[PDB]
Amino acid sequence: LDPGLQPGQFSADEAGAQLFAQSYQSSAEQVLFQSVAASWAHDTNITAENARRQEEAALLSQEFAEAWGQKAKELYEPIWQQFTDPQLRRIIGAVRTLGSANLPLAKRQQYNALLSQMSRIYSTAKVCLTCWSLDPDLTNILASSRSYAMLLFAWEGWHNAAGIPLKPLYEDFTALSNEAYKQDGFTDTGAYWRSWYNSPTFEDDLEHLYQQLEPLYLNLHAFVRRALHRRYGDRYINLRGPIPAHLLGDMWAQSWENIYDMVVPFPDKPNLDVTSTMLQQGWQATHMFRVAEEFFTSLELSPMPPEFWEGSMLEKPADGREVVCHASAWDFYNRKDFRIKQCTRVTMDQLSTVHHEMGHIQYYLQYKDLPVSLRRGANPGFHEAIGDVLALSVSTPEHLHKIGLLDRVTNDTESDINYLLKMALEKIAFLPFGYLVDQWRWGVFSGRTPPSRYNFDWWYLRTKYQGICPPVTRNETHFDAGAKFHVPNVTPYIRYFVSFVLQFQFHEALCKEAGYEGPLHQCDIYRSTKAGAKLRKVLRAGSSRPWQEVLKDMVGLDALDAQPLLKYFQLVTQWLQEQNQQNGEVLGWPEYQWHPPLPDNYPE
Ligand SMILES: *[C@@H]1O[C@H](CO[C@@H]2O[C@@H](C)[C@@H](O)[C@@H](O)[C@@H]2O)[C@@H](O[C@@H]2O[C@H](CO)[C@@H](O[C@@H]3O[C@H](CO)[C@@H](O)[C@H](O)[C@@H]3O)[C@H](O)[C@H]2NC(C)=O)[C@H](O)[C@H]1NC(C)=O
Ligand SMILES: O=C(O)[C@@H]1C[C@@H](C2CCCCC2)CN1C(=O)CP(=O)(O)CCCCc1ccccc1
Ligand SMILES: *[C@@H]1O[C@H](CO)[C@@H](O[C@@H]2O[C@H](CO)[C@@H](O)[C@H](O)[C@H]2NC(C)=O)[C@H](O)[C@H]1NC(C)=O
Ligand SMILES: *[C@@H]1O[C@H](CO[C@@H]2O[C@@H](C)[C@@H](O)[C@@H](O)[C@@H]2O)[C@@H](O)[C@H](O)[C@H]1NC(C)=O
Ligand SMILES: [Ca+2]
Ligand SMILES: [Cl-]
Ligand code: NA
Ligand SMILES: [Zn+2]
Numbered sequence: 001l002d003p004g005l006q007p008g009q010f011s012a013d014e015a016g017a018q019l020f021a022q023s024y025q026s027s028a029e030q031v032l033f034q035s036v037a038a039s040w041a042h043d044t045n046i047t048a049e050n051a052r053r054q055e056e057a058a059l060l061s062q063e064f065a066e067a068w069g070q071k072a073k074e075l076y077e078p079i080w081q082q083f084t085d086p087q088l089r090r091i092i093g094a095v096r097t098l099g100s101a102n103l104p105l106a107k108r109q110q111y112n113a114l115l116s117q118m119s120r121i122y123s124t125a126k127v128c129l130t131c132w133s134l135d136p137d138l139t140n141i142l143a144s145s146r147s148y149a150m151l152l153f154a155w156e157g158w159h160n161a162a163g164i165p166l167k168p169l170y171e172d173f174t175a176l177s178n179e180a181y182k183q184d185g186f187t188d189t190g191a192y193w194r195s196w197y198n199s200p201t202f203e204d205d206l207e208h209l210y211q212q213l214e215p216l217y218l219n220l221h222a223f224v225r226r227a228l229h230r231r232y233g234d235r236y237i238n239l240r241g242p243i244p245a246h247l248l249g250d251m252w253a254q255s256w257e258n259i260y261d262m263v264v265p266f267p268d269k270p271n272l273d274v275t276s277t278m279l280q281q282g283w284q285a286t287h288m289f290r291v292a293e294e295f296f297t298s299l300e301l302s303p304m305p306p307e308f309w310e311g312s313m314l315e316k317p318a319d320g321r322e323v324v325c326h327a328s329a330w331d332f333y334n335r336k337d338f339r340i341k342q343c344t345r346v347t348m349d350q351l352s353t354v355h356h357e358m359g360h361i362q363y364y365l366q367y368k369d370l371p372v373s374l375r376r377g378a379n380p381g382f383h384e385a386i387g388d389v390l391a392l393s394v395s396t397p398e399h400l401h402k403i404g405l406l407d408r409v410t411n412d413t414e415s416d417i418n419y420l421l422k423m424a425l426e427k428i429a430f431l432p433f434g435y436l437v438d439q440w441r442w443g444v445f446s447g448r449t450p451p452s453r454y455n456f457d458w459w460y461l462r463t464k465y466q467g468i469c470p471p472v473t474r475n476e477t478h479f480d481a482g483a484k485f486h487v488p489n490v491t492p493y494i495r496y497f498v499s500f501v502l503q504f505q506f507h508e509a510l511c512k513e514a515g516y517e518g519p520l521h522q523c524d525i526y527r528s529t530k531a532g533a534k535l536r537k538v539l540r541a542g543s544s545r546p547w548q549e550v551l552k553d554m555v556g557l558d559a560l561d562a563q564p565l566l567k568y569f570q571l572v573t574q575w576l577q578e579q580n581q582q583n584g585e586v587l588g589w590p591e592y593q594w595h596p597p598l599p600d601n602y603p604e
Contacts, residue, residue, distance in 0.1 A: 001063045005031060007071040014083045017076050021091045021371060024068055028372045031064045032333035040330060042116075043341060044313050046124060046322040051116045058112040065101040072096045087374060087544050094373040099192075100176075102183035107176055114173045118488035121165050123324045127157030134158060134251070135316070135325035135343045142251050143258040143347075148236055149599045152471050155246035159474075159483045166482035171451045173490070174444055190445035193438070193492050197379050198546065205560065206435065206494070209501060212562040213431050216569060219576040220428050221467050222585040224248070224256060227263045240586045241594035242469035245462070252484055253468050254433040256425040257349050263421060266414040270397060272422050274405040275347045281404070285314045285344035288351050291403060292358045295390050299525070299532025301539075302365045304358070307337050316343035326485045327353050329360030331375065335368040352391045352426070359387020366539035378538065378547035381498025386539070388503040389510065393524040395423065402526070411522070413571075420521055420572035427500055428569065432465035434497035440481055441493070454479055467589045471596055502551075504565035509555040510534060520568045 005027045010016040038057035042050035072080070072095045080092040100111050125134070132138050132154070141154040177189045186192040194202050221243070228247055229237040236244065249258025260273055289304075289312075297303050317323060325343035332338065340357045344350055363386055367375050377383030393399055397419065400406035440461050443449035449457045455474055458481045462468055474480060481487045508520060514528035525531040534554060541550050552558040566573070580587065 001060070001067055005064055005067075007068050010075060012075045013079070014085065014088070017080065017083065017088055017092060018085070020072070020075065021088060021095075021373075024091075024095060025371050025373075027064070028068075029333050029335075031061055032372065033337075035061045036330060036332045040332075040339070040341070043119075043324040043328075044317075044321070046120055046324070051120065055109070055112040055116055058115075059108060062101040062103075062108050062112075065098055069096050069098040069101065087371070090543065091371055091373040097184050098180075099184065100180045102180045103176065107179070111173070111176045111180070114169050114176070115490060118166055118169050118173065118482075118490075119324065121169075122162050122482075122485060122488040123326070124322050125158070125161040125165075127154065127161055132157075133325070134162075136345055138251065139345075142246070143249050146231070148232060148247070149602055151246040152599065153603055155251065156472050158251060159478065159480050162483040162488075163479035163481070164477060166488050167451070167454065167479035170454075170479065170482055170488065177490075178445060188445040188447070190438070190442035193494075194442070197381075197498075206497070209560060209562050210431070210435055212566065213428075213501075216424070216428050216566070216573050216576075217431055218467075218587045219573065219580055220424050222580045222587050223576050224259065224263055224425075224429075226583060226585060227259070231262060236596045238591055238594045238596075240589065241591035242463050242467045242589045244471040244596045245468040246471050248429070248468070252433065253466060254430050255349065256429040257422065260422050260425060263425070264418055265421065266418050269410055269412075269415045269418050270406055270408045272397065272400075272406075272419060273348055274400060275349075277405050278346050278348065278351075283346050285342075285346070285354075288344060288346070288354045289314060289340070289358065291351075292355045292387075292390070292394075295355070295394060295526060296358065296362055298527045299535065300529045301362055301532055301536060304361065305336075305338065305365075308339060308361065311337060312339040313341045314344055326489075327357050329357045329364070331364040331368075333372055333375070338364050349426075351394070352388075355391040355394060356384075356387035359383075359385075359390065362386060363539050366536060367542035370542045370544060374542040374544045376543045378541060378543060378545065378550040379498070380492065380495035381502050382538070382547065382550075384495045384499035385503040385506060386535075388499060389506045389535075390525075392503065392507050393526055396522055396524050398522065399524045399526060416519075416521070416571055417575050420569055421576075423521070424569060424572055427565075430500055431497065432467075434493065434500055436461040436465040437481075437484070437486065437493035441487070452476060454481065463589070463592060469595050472598065473595070498560065501560050501562055501565060504568050505551070505555045505557070505561055506535075507568070508564040519571075520564070521571075 008023065010020040035057040038054040042054045072092055076092055080089060083089045100108060103111060126132060127138060138154045138158050141150060145151050181189045181192045184192065186195070199205060225237065225239060225243050228243065229239055232247065245253050248256045250256065293304050313323065316325060323343065324341065327342035330339045330341065338361050340361060342353065342357060344354065360383060363377065363383055397406055397409050397415070401409045440449065440458055443457060444454070455476050455478050459470060459474065486493050507523065510525050510531040511520065511523035513534045514525045514531040516523045538550055538554055548558040
């Protein structure tokens with residue numbers, strides 16, 4: 001570790017810890033910048049040389065974390081929990097968490113190499129017949145093909161190409177990750193991840209939220225399954241079984257918005273899928289980011305700095321570079337450089353993703369003056385919710401009209417049902433998936449799910465919560481969890497379930513603050529500087545304060561709450577229940593063992 005980056009001696013008291021934290025911040029920014037920059041260079045240009053550079057930067061970060069973490073314990077272990085400065089307690093708490101820096105050198109290198117190789121495999125995997133990438137090629141097939149056999153080829157091809165080679169690496173990663181965090185005092189890595197929510201009843205709290213939400217998902221599921229049965233027929237759709245996992249418009253069946261045309265009940269109302277209008281009008285990726293930015297500035301939040309426009313990767317490169325296309329938002333920890341890396345496609349759902357990413361950036365801009373250790377969301381679910389809250393306002397027909405994407409605005413109950421159904425395909429359908437991904441990983445980290453049951457337990461959970469089934473037989477040579485970005489890229493997922501609940505609590509509070517009085521689903525907080533001020537107070541707080549207190553200041557409650565989401569969707573919840581009763585549906589999938597047959601001439 002460079003001499004200028006090493007911790008000196010400080011007095012073993014709170015005054016000394018303040019100075020220690022200031023000195024840490026100065027050097028941490030340098031070490032994080034080099035690590036984030038090396039990761040950027042690789043993720044926008046996947047090469048062996050750039051991977052090498054990123055692994056060397058990660059090794060330096062581990063040296064830094066070990067030196068400062070050990071110094072924090074040497075000086076403050078018996079006293080930091082009693083410091084009067086609550087933010088300093090949180091800073092010291094973070095610095096003394098070494099994570100992978102607990103590993104000896106050789107295992108650090110193995111750990112860093114595994115992360116690099118799992119990332120490369122996921123983002124360079126192809127499906128060949130001439131080869132298709134996940135983004136845009138297979139994504140577009142899953143979204144717009146209605147050939148059962150073509151969807152199956154893409155779904156099976158992708159899961160095989162990404163998942164199979166990842167399994168041996170993921171086993172090794174898990175063991176090293178657990179070894180690292182056991183030395184920070186956690187039973188396993190999942191316990192460390194769950195500890196971020198600082199709730200002794202986290203898992204019970206989540207389960208009670210899901211019990212309130214599940215009836216909405218069950219009714220959406222049955223209605224969509226019936227719509228698919230009318231198109232694909234009784235051979236490929238079992239009205240009492242799980243839905244084949246490749247038929248819902250998305251590789252992971254996690255968002256069902258692409259099958260809106262098959263379920264829309266009132267099709268002579270305005271067409272809420274504005275993708276075709278975006279294309280007709282000549283929208284490009286940069287337009288989508290400028291439109292998102294101007295929503296933020298309408299709230300008197302910050303515009304994107306020049307460094308963002310000059311440095312970001314907002315489209316897939318056409319120069320032959322391999323890149324990580326999965327959308328992400330980057331803080332370089334120098335208070336200057338902030339970037340999005342997204343292979344943006346011109347579609348309505350990508351407009352939502354753009355807003356999601358710019359919500360991340362906006363958080364970074366607002367808390368950039370805090371100490372580096374507090375530059376994060378009040379909890380990770382907060383960070384995932386910011387952009388989604390704005391996207392809820394952007395998606396309303398009145399707002400789409402204002403930005404020229406919808407010529408006619410109607411305000412009637414049929415239009416309400418269309419709108420809420422489309423939003424439910426996006427928000428309700430996701431809930432079981434957002435919940436189940438980390439249940440899978442928590443079991444892997446705890447040892448409940450050994451490598452010999454990776455796929456067995458994945459599909460147990462996929463069927464249990466989502467009510468889907470694989471369209472071809474799978475076995476433990478397959479590693480289908482690994483075919484989802486966040487698993488090989490070691491990004492926790494429960495934050496997205498928390499986000500999908502939280503964003504409706506935020507929306508309700510900001511709509512009230514904006515003076516809006518009508519139905520929650522027609523609120524648009526555009527140009528509400530009062531709502532902007534309330535959101536800004538959250539963003540500027542970072543992790544300086546307990547999330548429960550930040551939430552209470554914002555929405556009036558110190559806990560996650562499903563009631564705002566339930567209230568948003570109430571009209572379509574009742575409508576779907578009525579439709580399913582009238583149609584004689586079975587809610588759920590009691591024929592849980594059912595899988596569809598293979599097409600006759602497959603893959604031929
Ligand atoms: C879409 O339309 C709904 C319903 O509009 C109502 O019913 C129609 C058939 C017409 O008769 C309308 O004239 C009538 O308002 C709108 O929802 C309604 O919004 C108004 C405010 O714009 C709400 O009134 C307020 O209520 C609060 C608390 O009660 C008072 O403090 C205010 O002073 C004000 O009176 C009204 O409650 C609300 N109704 C429902 C059922 O939500 C909706 O705003 C509209 N959408 C858009 C985008 O304009
Ligand atoms: O794709 C998913 O599964 C989820 C749900 C989706 C969301 C889009 C808007 C509407 C609701 C669904 C967004 N997302 C993401 O992973 C996008 P991120 O930036 O969090 C992914 C961040 C990955 C970790 C990272 C962070 C910084 C730099 C490099 C890597
Ligand atoms: C992608 O990364 C590679 C390195 O992995 C870059 O190639 C280097 O480019 C510099 C300047 O052009 C040369 O001096 C080096 O000799 C190159 N190294 C190798 C290994 O080829 C490449 O420029 C990057 N591409 C983009 C578009 O940024
Ligand atoms: C695992 O699965 C591989 C792929 O074939 C699958 O299983 C066979 C039995 C058929 O049902 C086919 O439709 C499926 O896609 C096999 O190549 C492999 O042998 C299977 N077994 C193991 C241990 O890997
Ligand atoms: Ca779409
Ligand atoms: Cl999380
Ligand atoms: Na989608
Ligand atoms: Zn995100």
